[PDB]
A paper describes a structure:
The bacterial metallo-β-lactamases (MBLs) catalyze the inactivation of β-lactam antibiotics. Class B members, known as the metallo-β-lactamases (MBLs), are structurally distinct from the Class A, C, and D enzymes, require one or two zinc ions for catalytic activity, and are not inhibited by currently approved therapeutics. One variant of significance is [name]-4, first identified in 2012 (17). Although it differs from [name] by a single amino acid substitution, namely M154L, it demonstrates increased enzymatic activity against the carbapenems and several cephalosporins.
Crystals of the [name]-4/Compound 1 complex were obtained from poly(ethylene glycol) 3350 solutions at pH 6.0 and contained one molecule per asymmetric unit. The model was refined to an overall R-factor of 20.3% at 1.3 Å resolution. Compound 1 functions as a bidentate ligand to Zn2, which is also surrounded by the side chains of Asp 124, Cys 208, and His 250 and the bridging solvent in an octahedral coordination sphere. The bond distances between Zn2 and the sulfur and oxygen atoms of Compound 1 are 2.5 Å and 2.0 Å, respectively. The coordination geometry around Zn1 remains tetrahedral with the side chains of His 120, His 122, and His 189, and the bridging solvent serving as ligands. Both the side chain of Lys 211 and backbone amide nitrogen of Asn 220 serve to anchor the carboxylate moiety of Compound 1 into the active site. In addition to the difference in coordination geometry to the binuclear metal center, the side chain of Asn 220 swings toward the active site upon Compound 1 binding. Within experimental error, the distance between Zn1 and Zn2 when Compound 1 binds remains the same as observed in the apoenzyme model (∼3.6 Å). In the [name]-4/Compound 1 complex, the bridging water is within 1.9 Å and 2.0 Å from Zn1 and Zn2, respectively. Our results demonstrate that Compound 1, an inhibitor directed against [name]-4, demonstrates a unique binding mode, whereby it forms a bidentate interaction with Zn2 in an octahedral coordination sphere.
Numbering used by the authors: 41 to 270
């Protein structure tokens, strides 16, 4: 009903200062796969969570931001070294945008056929980002839940909203599978899922890479499906 099309992307306002960006890529056995990230206005700047699949699509995200918000993009954080999350890093860099990822994502990105972020996040033992490594993140609350979908997957809550972003760790409350497990940590996936849920106990809107936003039943149901792996 409320989704705004812009070229080949889709933008959905989730909250006063928060939009979901969605881009698509054909893959065998799936069709044209939606990948979601976030756009957050924080005062006079914009923050991005995840690229689109490609440079061109990512440049279109920046064009939408220019048209609809018309404020500088201060930074992007990208939530692991796969194409749906880091495929457009060159577009961000060309645009002069500072980029952040888990240290491990930056380490894996070259061999994944991806471009590393410019800055590395590190995490306390409890999984909260070390705040000095995430300067100017404003309302973004970055959390490493443990290895799951990938060894390097991270998650993002938004202060002052009921939104938490699971990226490709979380699936929707009616999801059939855990999707791509080629890089999954089969032993630990199950626990990582429930850690995300625990880190963001108040969030009623669970946003994720490959489904529309859902209730926390997404977390309960993802944890459940994961339990069957270990
Ligand atoms: O693991 C999934 O849920 C998944 C399914 C289809 C495509 C991609 S990129 N992912 O991560
Ligand atoms: Zn992935
Ligand atoms: Zn994915």
């Amino acid at each position: 009903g409320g989704d705004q099309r812009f070229g080949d992307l889709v933008f959905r306002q989730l909250a006063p200062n928060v939009w979901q960006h969605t881009s698509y890529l054909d893959m065998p056995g799936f069709g044209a796969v939606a990948s979601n990230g976030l756009i957050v206005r924080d005062g006079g700047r914009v923050l991005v969570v995840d690229t689109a699949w490609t440079d061109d699509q990512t440049a279109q995200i920046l064009n939408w931001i220019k048209q609809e918000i018309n404020l500088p993009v201060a930074l992007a954080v990208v939530t692991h070294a796969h194409q749906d999350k880091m495929g457009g890093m060159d577009a961000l860099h060309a645009a002069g945008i500072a980029t952040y990822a888990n240290a491990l994502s930056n380490q894996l990105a070259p061999q994944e056929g991806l471009v590393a972020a410019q800055h590395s996040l590190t995490f306390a033992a409890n999984g909260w980002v070390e705040p000095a490594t995430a300067p100017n993140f404003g309302p973004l609350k970055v959390f490493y839940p443990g290895p799951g979908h990938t060894s390097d997957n991270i998650t993002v809550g938004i202060d002052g909203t009921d939104i938490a972003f699971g990226g490709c760790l979380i699936k929707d409350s009616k999801a059939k599978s855990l999707g791509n497990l080629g890089d999954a940590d089969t032993e630990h996936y199950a626990a990582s899922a429930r850690a995300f849920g625990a880190a963001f106990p108040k969030a009623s809107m669970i946003v994720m890479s490959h489904s529309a936003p859902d209730s926390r039943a997404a977390i309960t149901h993802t944890a459940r499906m994961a339990d069957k792996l270990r």
